[PDB]
Design a protein around this ligand. Sequence first.
Ligand SMILES: OC[C@H]1O[C@@H](O[C@@H]2[C@@H](O)[C@H](O[C@@H]3[C@@H](O)[C@H](n4cc(COCc5cccs5)nn4)O[C@H](CO)[C@H]3O)O[C@H](CO)[C@H]2O)[C@H](O)[C@@H](O)[C@@H]1O
Ligand SMILES: OC[C@H]1O[C@@H](O[C@@H]2[C@@H](O)[C@H](O[C@@H]3[C@@H](O)[C@H](O)O[C@H](CO)[C@H]3O)O[C@H](CO)[C@H]2O)[C@H](O)[C@@H](O)[C@@H]1O
Length: 429
Amino acid sequence: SFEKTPAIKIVGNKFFDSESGEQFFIKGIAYQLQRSSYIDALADPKICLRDIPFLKMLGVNTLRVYAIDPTKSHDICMEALSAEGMYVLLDLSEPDISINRENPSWDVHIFERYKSVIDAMSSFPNLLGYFAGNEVTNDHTNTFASPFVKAAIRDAKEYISHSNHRKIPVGYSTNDDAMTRDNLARYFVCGDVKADFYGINMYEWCGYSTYGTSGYRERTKEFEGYPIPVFFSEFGCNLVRPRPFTEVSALYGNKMSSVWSGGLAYMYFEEENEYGVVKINDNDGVDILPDFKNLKKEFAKADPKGITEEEYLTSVECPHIAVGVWEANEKLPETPDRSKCACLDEILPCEIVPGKYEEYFSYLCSKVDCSDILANGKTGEYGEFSDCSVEQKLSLQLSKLYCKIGANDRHCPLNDKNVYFNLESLQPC
Ligand SMILES: OC[C@H]1O[C@@H](O[C@@H]2[C@@H](O)[C@H](O[C@@H]3[C@@H](O)[C@H](n4cc(COCc5cccs5)nn4)O[C@H](CO)[C@H]3O)O[C@H](CO)[C@H]2O)[C@H](O)[C@@H](O)[C@@H]1O
Ligand SMILES: OC[C@H]1O[C@@H](O[C@@H]2[C@@H](O)[C@H](O[C@@H]3[C@@H](O)[C@H](O)O[C@H](CO)[C@H]3O)O[C@H](CO)[C@H]2O)[C@H](O)[C@@H](O)[C@@H]1O
């Protein structure tokens, strides 16, 4: 039963409860355990059922989860959250399978990860939304990563659209770099592809600050009339401790509640970073920390004045390119084609099984033309096989070199144990 969590839907720039028609405001906390690769607390009933009672005491209605294991079951924890009126915002990526801001790609490997998460989690009515990226572009030196994230948003939305699932919204979580924030916000709603919602990881309010002095007033004026729901995907500057969380009073007050859809505190678990509200002891029990009571008290006082769906019902230009400032082309990479790329596994004479990549690409791309695997988010030029996996891309170039030599003797021209001649290439997509 998910009776206590009706699906949330988006209308204009606001969230609404699909049954009652009341505006939904996020009162959230980040919930993600790390090791001393990722840990999936929502796949382990003994963990999630320990913490839900404490999450209930805090008075949250939403969790942000950064990584799940899509091969494991999540119905016990998701149903337990639903029984306390709690929703989940979920990142599709994980640390080892993400759009790399230093060398961005949108490819079959990352897209399959996103699809796997979507197929694991879309059956739950309390899945609020998916993030297609988190702080990919984070300063003026890597703005060319953003077209790859926009392609990911497009393709995740289309995959969801063509599935039998509820049309769960797909958005983006960004940082708060002064030089890039306005351009990033405009970019993710420009042209033909738009984020469904926009989260900012917001740490401007430290200690006993105010609406005016924190920067919250200027941020609120910047985002007034923004066409999609906007919220703080993280908050909780820890400069002054114990964190009073007085930003919460501002966030759900009358000035900010007309613009923002709430926010999520960072975070539940203490992990030697002074950001937790509880610490898990050596006996796996929950020790409440000094921040807990302040967040609890602040969420309890928060009473956002929203508007109902009925009374509410009653193309934007992409930022121009400027060298060293904004370098994200409007033109996006194509949808990764799993079948086309899988055909390379069948037909290529020379293959490589998954430091080595940099050396091998450097070597092979001085002997053959690697344009067909290059992807340039600045110029909007995306090679024909730039959507394939890194090993497929490498295999293509090795095979091109093999055919260029033309010895035709099954000896692939690269000395490495991972290289092998593909016997399927001989069998006459
Ligand atoms: O796509 C951009 C990058 O993604 C990276 O993986 C990503 C990973 O780094 C990120 O880590 C999160 C991490 O960034 C986040 N976190 C939050 C904070 C608080 O920051 C306080 C501040 C300090 C200074 C100013 S504000 N610090 N870390 O905590 C989360 C839960 O513990 C973590 O999941 O979680 C993502 C989702 O799963 C992965 O997509 C990849 O590893 C990179 O290669 C890639 O470039
Ligand atoms: O500079 C790049 C860096 O920006 C970070 O966001 C900053 C905020 O950290 C900063 O926050 C506070 C001040 O606005 C406020 O007046 O005082 C407190 C200290 O008492 C500051 O911490 O404000 C600036 C400007 O609005 C923000 O850009 C991002 O979080 C980070 O991702 C980025 O790397």
